[PDB]
RNA sequence: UGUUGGUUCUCCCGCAACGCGGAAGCGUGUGCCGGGAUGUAGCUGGCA
């Protein structure tokens, strides 16, 4: 669809001159609706869409074959670029125990997601884990993560839903010193960015336990509402980084582009299934192609 | 009024209502107020609101589960949407209208599952059948079935496990599930409900497109509608699929399930 | 308890599907509730 739209525009309103502003309009349009349907939020489309009409201004167009090839080379390119880099990692390297905070609305893969860098953090980076679960909310999600512990070979700090998550992560934190362990990996119940309570608690757990890391845990389908619900995380917490799961889906994912842009924070890990080795890292080009197509 | 085309566009998107079904009902709209020659806004809000009403229309049928013994529910549809959660909300509701009701644990994937739905079972004190994770989930559903009609069971209900849509072997095993219901009632699965979060974006066009041409949908139930998701997808999908929405889910205790009104559905979409 | 139908794990095999891989091949929350062996075994359903 890209090309053949790109080209489409280019042939039909300009011939062969260089790209000139007056050439731009339909392809601006065009590549916003292509961002839409593939969820991208609609502010992060203007902003992406501004730097495009700069790059279409000056364009050394006119000498390439096909303008549409050109025009997505430069699509394509900045879209990489808004991505970040490669190779972003977990900080591992400081003080231990490495903690890192789970966050993120119900349903996202947090627990699965925990799971899965427990099998990470022992197998690859010869790392001694323990995984604790403070979500006392929705049912058997401790026994889900015991589970999960159990599968990876990790430790599990075992808490129950009469307890209240601050002492939960408290004593989690509190054994991992104590036992030298070389990470904590904190699992938190989902909420929603207008529940005032649990916000305040999610911020209490992040005040508690200083983590190194915070990862923001979005599901790869998520629409429009990812541009509300990042901002407030952002707001709410210091986020190191983003998980982003279920891109093992059809979804285009654009809500990745959204929440990169509003947050700012580096997209860490790619979830690929609801297996515990379905984890992937981060390569800005292949998901730029993807919400492309 | 530029200003206006620019800024009502941009409401129906934020709310994920995509960029088709957008074009239908402005076009319907502008055709609409230029015919009534409306002048003023409250009008056009009224006539915005009474088109969208006529996409709804055809898809407010509630769910009937009198009549079967037993009345079986199939709960569909991908990870994490609330299925399990809706099928918790769905006993009460049940059992508050003099049904029996009975659970299958027919998710033997993901871990916990069957824990998860058992908590379900004793909030609503009634029974669920299980056996374990790695058990088969269409002969889990099967035993239910046989086990409500022995039982007298009024209404059962079966938990499927979360799948994403493109991964077409899942798929044939949903239609497994169905295929083996068959030897016990040819019309069961009485419902089989689509289960969709709000926060979804246009793939719920695919999901709803792929499970129904898997499974023949008859109903959908809209989840996590108590945040700040409007979940417009829904219009496209009724647009092209005609799916009778049954329920919403407003929050994670046992009462948050409210039958679908679409009246209500239109307030909470503008505000 | 009595009888049967599922299923799981262990062994054996067939046909096909899906996933990954130049291929050979490696797999399996896939289908034929495929076919067998087996447990003193589990878990599940029906009926007396
Ligand atoms: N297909 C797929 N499913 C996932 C992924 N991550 C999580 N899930 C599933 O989504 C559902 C919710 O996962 P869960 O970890 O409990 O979400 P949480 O509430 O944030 O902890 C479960 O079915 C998971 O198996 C993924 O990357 N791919
Ligand atoms: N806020 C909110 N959360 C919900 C709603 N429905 C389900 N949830 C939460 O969504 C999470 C995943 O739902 P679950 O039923 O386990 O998903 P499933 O894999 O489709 O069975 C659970 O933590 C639920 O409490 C809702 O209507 N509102
Ligand atoms: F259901 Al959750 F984290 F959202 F366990
Ligand atoms: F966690 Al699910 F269906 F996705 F139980
Ligand atoms: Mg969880
Ligand atoms: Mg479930």
Redesign the interface.
């Known amino acids: 669809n890209l090309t053949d739209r790109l080209s489409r525009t280019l042939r039909n309103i300009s011939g062969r001159g260089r790209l000139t502003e007056d050439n731009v309009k339909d392809t601006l349009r065009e590549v916003r609706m292509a961002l839409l349907e593939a969820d991208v939020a609609l502010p992060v489309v203007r902003e992406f869409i501004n730097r495009v009409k700069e790059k279409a201004v000056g364009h050394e167009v006119n000498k390439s074959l096909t303008p549409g090839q050109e025009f997505v080379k430069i699509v394509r390119n900045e879209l990489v670029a808004a991505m970040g880099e490669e190779n972003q990692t977990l900080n591992l390297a400081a003080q231990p125990p490495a903690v890192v905070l789970m966050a993120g609305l119900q349903g996202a893969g947090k627990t699965t997601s925990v799971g899965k860098l427990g099998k990470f953090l022992r197998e690859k980076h010869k790392k001694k884990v323990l995984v604790v679960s403070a979500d006392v909310y929705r049912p058997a999600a401790i026994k889900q993560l015991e589970t999960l512990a159990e599968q990876v070979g990790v430790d599990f700090f075992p808490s129950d839903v009469g307890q209240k998550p601050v002492d939960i992560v408290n004593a989690a934190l509190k054994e991992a010193k104590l036992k030298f362990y070389d990470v904590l990996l904190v699992d938190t119940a989902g909420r929603l960015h207008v529940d005032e309570a649990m916000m305040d608690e999610i911020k209490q757990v992040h005040a508690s336990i200083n983590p190194v890391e915070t990862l923001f845990v979005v599901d790869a389908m998520t629409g429009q509402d990812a541009a509300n619900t990042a901002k407030a995380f952002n707001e709410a917490l210091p986020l190191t980084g983003v998980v982003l799961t279920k891109v093992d889906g059809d979804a285009r994912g654009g809500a990745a582009l959204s929440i990169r842009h509003i947050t700012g924070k580096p997209i860490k890990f790619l979830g690929v299934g609801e297996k515990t080795e379905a984890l992937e890292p981060f390569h800005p080009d292949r998901i730029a192609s993807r919400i492309l197509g | 009024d530029d200003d206006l085309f620019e800024e009502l566009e941009?409401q129906l998107?934020?709310?994920?209502v995509?960029?088709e079904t957008t074009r239908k009902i402005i076009t319907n709209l502008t055709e609409g107020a230029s015919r009534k020659q409306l002048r003023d806004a409250e009008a056009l809000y009224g006539l915005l609101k009474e088109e969208m009403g006529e996409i709804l229309a055809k898809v407010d049928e509630p769910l009937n589960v009198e009549g079967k013994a037993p009345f079986v529910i199939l709960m569909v549809g991908?990870?994490?949407?609330?299925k399990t959660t809706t099928i918790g909300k769905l006993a009460r509701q049940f059992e508050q209208q003099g049904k029996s009701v009975m659970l299958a644990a027919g998710d033997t994937?993901?871990?916990?599952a069957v824990?998860?739905l058992?908590?379900?079972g004793q909030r609503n004190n009634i029974p669920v059948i299980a056996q374990h994770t790695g058990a088969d989930s269409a002969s889990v559903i099967f035993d239910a079935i046989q086990a409500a009609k022995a039982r007298n069971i009024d209404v059962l209900i079966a938990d499927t496990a979360g799948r994403?849509?493109?991964?077409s072997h899942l798929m044939e095993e949903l239609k497994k599930i169905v295929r083996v219901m068959k030897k016990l009632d040819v019309e069961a699965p009485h419902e089989v409900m689509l289960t969709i979060?709000?926060?979804?974006?246009?793939?719920?066009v695919?999901q709803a497109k792929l499970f129904h041409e898997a499974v023949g949908l008859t109903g959908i139930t809209l989840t996590?509608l108590?945040?700040?998701?409007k979940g417009g997808?829904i219009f496209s999908v009724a647009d092209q699929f005609g799916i009778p929405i049954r329920y919403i889910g407003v929050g994670?205790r046992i009462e948050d399930l409210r039958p679908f009104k679409a009246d209500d559905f239109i307030e909470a979409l503008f505000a």
């Not at chain 2, 108590?226 to 998701?229: C, L, Q």
């Open positions: 941009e998107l934020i709310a994920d995509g960029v991908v990870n994490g949407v609330g994937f993901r871990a916990a824990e998860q058992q908590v379900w994403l849509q493109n991964k979060d709000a926060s979804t974006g246009q793939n719920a695919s996590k108590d945040g700040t998701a997808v994670e």
